[PDB]
Amino acid sequence: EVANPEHYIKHPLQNRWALWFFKNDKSKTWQANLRLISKFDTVEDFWALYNHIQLSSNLMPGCDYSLFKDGIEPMWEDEKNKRGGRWLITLNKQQRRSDLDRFWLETLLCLIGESFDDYSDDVCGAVVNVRAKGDKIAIWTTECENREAVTHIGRVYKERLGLPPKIVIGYQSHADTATKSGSTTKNRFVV
């Protein structure tokens, strides 16, 4: 003889997530400008957070928002990111108005909804970069050598965002990040 949980319990998410903010400051290290906002693990708590913060579209150029599974820091050095990479979405200046905010929300929902099904374990989180030269959004995965998982995640993500199918996107390995003044990171896969 107990109350029906459907009438009062919050709707749980498979994982607990953490949202981070990056504030641009040249006089300090990258890590020093990165700070945690808060965490949540239910549908209700996700909306409570999203509804009171600024849309990416309104942030000052140079700042970022990052949503990662609790325990995984949004940086290359992390145990779960060092051997991984990211599927990169490169937006033009006009998309700041038309697609940035809509794309970022769909990205958030793809993560907390575990929309990559059988390859959910390879997903680490996502990052949106607000920049004057052109905004960027990316989904980070844990292992660049897991071809099956990486290509499936890329396909689903591209489909969910809904941009024209003829547009190809690439996946970059973090370890491959350019360090030689005169080169640029190449793509491991494309979908």
Q: Which is nearer to ligand GTA, 46 or 140 (CB)?
A: 140
43-50 and 100-112 helices cross at what angle (nearest 10)? Answer: 160
CB of 55 to ligand GTA, least distance (A): 19
Q: Which is nearer to ligand GTA, 95 or 185 (CB)?
A: 185
What sign does the dihedral 178-73-172-147 (CA atoms) show? positive
User: Which helix or strand (DSSP H or E) is residue 171 part of?
Assistant: strand 170-173
CB of 60 to ligand GTA, least distance (A): 13
Ligand-binding annotation for 66, yes or no, is no
Ligand-binding annotation for 143, yes or no, is no
Q: Which is nearer to ligand GTA, 110 or 127 (CB)?
A: 127
Ligand-binding annotation for 18, yes or no, is no
Q: Which is nearer to ligand GTA, 65 or 116 (CB)?
A: 65
The Cα–Cα gap between 14 and 117 comes to: 12
Q: Tokens 């029906």 sit at which residue?
A: 4
Closest CA to 132 of 65, 62, 64: 62
Ligand-binding annotation for 20, yes or no, is no
- Structure tokens, 29: 């290290």
CB of 84 to ligand GTA, least distance (A): 11
The Cα–Cα gap between 72 and 57 comes to: 25
Closest residue to bound ligand GTA by CB: 75
Tell me, rounded to whole angstroms, the distance of Cα 123 from its chain centroid: 9
CB of 175 to ligand GTA, least distance (A): 12
Q: Which parts of this chain interact with ligand GTA (CB under 6 A)?
A: 30, 75-77, 129, 131, 177-181, 184-185
CB of 183 to ligand GTA, least distance (A): 6
The Cα–Cα gap between 162 and 145 comes to: 27
Ligand-binding annotation for 179, yes or no, is yes
Q: Which is nearer to ligand GTA, 71 or 162 (CB)?
A: 71
